[PDB]
Amino acid sequence: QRAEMINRSXXXXXXXXXXXXXXXXX
């Protein structure tokens, strides 16, 4: 059953990057 089991195997950051770009643009 372990063999049976093992066989089965960003927006906030984007907004933050946009905010960083805006802060740099000022």
Q: How many CA atoms lie within 13 A of 2 on its CB side?
A: 0
Q: Spell out the SS3 assignment of 1-26.
A: CHHHHHCCCCHHHHHHHHHHHHHHHC
Indicate which single residue of 10, 22, 23, 26 sits in contact with other proteins (rule: CB under 8 A): 10
Q: Pick from 4, 6, 8, 21: which binds other proteins (CB under 8 A)?
A: 21
Give yes or no for residue 19 binding other proteins (CB under 8 A).
Answer: no
Place of tokens 């960083």: 20
* Residue 22 binds other proteins, judged by CB under 8 A: no
Which positions lie near other proteins, rule CB under 8 A? 10-11, 13-15, 17-18, 21
